[PDB]
Design a protein around this nucleic acid. Sequence first.
RNA 1: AAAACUCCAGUUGACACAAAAUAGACUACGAAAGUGGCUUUAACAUAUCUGAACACACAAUAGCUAAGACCCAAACUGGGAUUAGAUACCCCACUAUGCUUAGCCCUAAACCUCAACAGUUCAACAAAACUGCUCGCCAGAACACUACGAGCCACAGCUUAAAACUCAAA
Lengths: 23, 116, 96, 63, 45, 136, 107, 122, 99, 86, 97
Amino acid sequence: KNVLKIRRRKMNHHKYRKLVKKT
Amino acid sequence: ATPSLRGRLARFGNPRKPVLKPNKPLILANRVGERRREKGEATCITEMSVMMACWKQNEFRDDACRKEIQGFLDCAARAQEARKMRSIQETLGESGSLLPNKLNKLLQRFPNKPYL
Amino acid sequence: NEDLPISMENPYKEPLKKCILCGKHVDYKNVQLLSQFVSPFTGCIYGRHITGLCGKKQKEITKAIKRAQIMGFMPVTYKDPAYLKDPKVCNIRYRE
Amino acid sequence: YHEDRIRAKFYSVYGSGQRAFDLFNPNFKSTCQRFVEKYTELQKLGETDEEKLFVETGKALLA
Amino acid sequence: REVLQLQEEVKNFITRENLEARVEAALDSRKNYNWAITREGLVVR
Amino acid sequence: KFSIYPPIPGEESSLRWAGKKFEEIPIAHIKASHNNTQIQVVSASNEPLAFASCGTEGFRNAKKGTGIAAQTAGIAAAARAKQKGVIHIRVVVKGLGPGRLSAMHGLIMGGLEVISITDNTPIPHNGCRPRKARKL
Amino acid sequence: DPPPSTLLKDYQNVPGIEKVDDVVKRLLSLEMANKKEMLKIKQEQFMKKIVANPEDTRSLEARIIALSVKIRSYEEHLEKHRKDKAHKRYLLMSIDQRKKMLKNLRN
Amino acid sequence: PRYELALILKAMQRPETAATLKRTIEALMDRGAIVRDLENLGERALPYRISAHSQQHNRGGYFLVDFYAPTAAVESMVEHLSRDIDVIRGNIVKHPLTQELKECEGIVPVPLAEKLYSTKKR
Amino acid sequence: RFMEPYIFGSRLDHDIIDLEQTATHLQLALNFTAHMAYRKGIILFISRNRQFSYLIENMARDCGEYAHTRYFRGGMLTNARLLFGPTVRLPDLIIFLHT
Amino acid sequence: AKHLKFIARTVMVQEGNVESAYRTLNRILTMDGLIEDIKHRRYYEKPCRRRQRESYERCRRIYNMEMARKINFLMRKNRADPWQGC
Amino acid sequence: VESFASMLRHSPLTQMGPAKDKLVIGRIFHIVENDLYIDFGGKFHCVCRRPEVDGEKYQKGTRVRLRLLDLELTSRFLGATTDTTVLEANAVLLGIQ
RNA sequence: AAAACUCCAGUUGACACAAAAUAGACUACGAAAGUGGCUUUAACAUAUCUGAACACACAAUAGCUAAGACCCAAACUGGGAUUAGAUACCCCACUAUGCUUAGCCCUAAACCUCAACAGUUCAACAAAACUGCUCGCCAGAACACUACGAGCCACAGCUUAAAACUCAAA
Ligand SMILES: [Mg+2]
Ligand SMILES: [Mg+2]
Ligand SMILES: [Mg+2]
Ligand SMILES: [Mg+2]
Ligand SMILES: [Mg+2]
Ligand SMILES: [Mg+2]
Ligand SMILES: [Mg+2]
Ligand SMILES: [Mg+2]
Ligand SMILES: [Mg+2]
Ligand SMILES: [Mg+2]
Ligand SMILES: [Mg+2]
Ligand SMILES: [Zn+2]
């Protein structure tokens, strides 16, 4: 199958992590 | 003897981890693969090398090392001949194993049947 | 009536093939036999296709070999050269 | 069939006959077949059981 | 039967008195376990 | 007749070369690395006769790890041996890396006679875990 | 806890053992043999004590005794081996099984 | 349980060897053993060189000792062996003759493992 | 699978057909064929064994009937209207020596 | 290291052919499986990857062997068209 | 009148049993230089080839002696729903008559 | 190829708390995670089945604390190359860490993405199609392994887990 649904999730997680790091 | 595939593939029946996880289905096809040959060959290097050495030793002349140079040339010629010979041979008629085309034809004559 | 067939216990069945080593008893002390199933050049243990053994037997051999190697009865990176002039059990090319 | 066992035994004892089998003509009698027939003749009413019966058959053949 | 066998064996076991002699005997003698199989199922030494 | 397997250090094998036993004949250690091959020559008592590699003879860099270079090195080694009196050699190989047969060839050319070839390439029975798998 | 010098569960019924050699006796004793024989002996003892019909092992009671013995063994093992988690798991499951059995018996 | 002690000595003349044997057996007895028989398997050349503690050896005598003993004693025995000088190594394996062989019928021919894939024209 | 009712058994892994059954079937089939022949009907023998192609052709010749022992092209019967003219009479019976 | 030095994977030469001996040695190595190991032990092959590789190998063997068998079975059937005409 | 079972019972193919190594007689009915098409009764034919020993004797019609190695030659392969038959027996020539 | 090393390289000895060729064309053991160097000791619940996202006991790797070992590997970092740039891919160096002992943490594409037990002979791809019974879970996309609450030796964490706004799809 695709890895397209996962990718979005991954992106979201990364962003969250970044946010956490920032604040 | 062919290695067994009894309780190896992850199937509904098995109470096991899969031994194998093959990306192609193990169903032997009605073809056989195309044949192969050749690489970074570099023939007659040893012959070359001696000649080179001789040249280095001397001034840099043909006159001093005329018996090595000639040998090298001969070797080269032989190699050339051999390539031609090879071409004549293994594409036309293989001595030992069959040509792939023939094998393919044979397979087609008695093809494998999963589709029942 | 009579000449119809009768269901019966599978005659003409030749008794199943043997390991060669089936009734035999394998010890780490016996280097000879163990040596026989090792490659003379590398001291690597031969497979099952090469050796031609039943699985239990093969396992027994291999464990025994291992034991020998640790306990100091057998060599490891080669097969002992005193035991080359012996019966060849295994099926192997090299030399031709 | 019941004679199959006997045939098998014969084979085990006496290797697959040097006499050539025909298969083309019907009512061919191989050596094995002959042996079987002999056995049948003997048992019922030979009464000595298997090995003994076999031996008897062999003896008969020899004669 | 097993018990009987054990009993039979026991008389030949090494105790503290029958020791040194036994050791000496062992030293003198040599058992060998190196039987070597052939291609068929047969033993040879 | 003729065995592939060598004569053991135990006695008594009816073989000599130049009036010497197998164990007495000198060893030529060829270390075929992936980008250079070094060829030592040593006596039976472990006295070094002649070191020679693809670096020592002329070449530097990736041109060390060619076959020609290896051959040259071998030749050099042979030459060095010849002064000290060697003639027959046992050969011992280490590693893989083109200059492996080439070295042998070079040695042969130099005039030394190859008696035997044994490769004690170190195959660790799981020892140290090597470098990470690079992107080719 | 049974004594070490006692005979096995195997070599008990047999006759001549009572008047036999000392070494032989030792050989056929719990002291020499492994823990499983000891366990068996314990089980037997328990059966003798409690159950109405010894030599059964299909009735609930017998099963329970066996379970108890197993639990005890596990506990003993876990005196040392305090990082052994599989054994702990076994203990815990087995206790619950025993409890269940007891409940059934009660019912 | 029954046990075998795969004892690998020197290579150091008879009397010394005898003494060593006496010692080892004595130790075993103390630990709580009933030693059964003695099997000297010659002084053979050792398959590799085998490093003591403190000397490295090439020749070495081989001995096997059949013995019944309690389960707890084995570790102690091993320790003792390790301590003792004239033993090159003393591994202790439980006796092979304990295990009776299951009577083999032999290798059975395994067929093609079938019905692994569905009937599709593909 | 679909020939198991007609099989008698298997003598050392070699299957043997019920001859009585065959006879019964034969009586029908042959009779039917005969009837077809009587009714001025086209019979078509077919095969792809090669060994017996010539024989089959000969048989076809000898009778009033036909044969087709060679490579069967796509739509000799379904498309007949094109492969031959528009007014063809197709076989009113067919026989396979080798199905 | 602690073994004897000239027994493991040596090949004696007859009358100075040398190349032949080398070839033989190589063949032996291949048979044992040493060369492949050496090639692979150049870098660390991670467990999962190794497993995958193994799987690939075993499957290949299963396939390949079967194919070979089939070929063997069918080498009987190369002759000439015996019925020819048709 | 006979049955079928009875007939089967007293017929040469059932009289012999398994075909593995059984010296059988059978006629040759077709020829292509090297190979010889041999009928030996049974289900299929088989082929052996002309030997050096009296090659000009093995003609169409003559009788020959086969060793017989199975009657049918079959095998099932990796993905096969059914074993793939050759339609030949595999039988080795002993000689003539 | 620069850099790096020349206290380097090769042969030969002496030489481990690291990691366990070949056997492994076997397919086992465990509940899963996982487990193929050797030895000994202990040792692998349950004579119905299902059954805790309120329990308890486990749970790779990574990670935290504290103290040890430290060959080799190696995030990070440094140097060299490469490129417009290279905070990468290639090279070289070296650290946390991988290892041991004692505590935590509790997540994986923890996937054989195929629940347990009893039984039987077609949407499309994939590992044919189903009965009985039980529990667990799911009911448009995204917002969302988010927010808020709650519990947790976790304080940048984990577990559970919304709504609005939006869209005619996903
Ligand atoms: Mg895939
Ligand atoms: Mg339950
Ligand atoms: Mg749960
Ligand atoms: Mg460190
Ligand atoms: Mg480093
Ligand atoms: Mg470790
Ligand atoms: Mg964890
Ligand atoms: Mg959880
Ligand atoms: Mg997993
Ligand atoms: Mg899932
Ligand atoms: Mg469930
Ligand atoms: Zn067996």
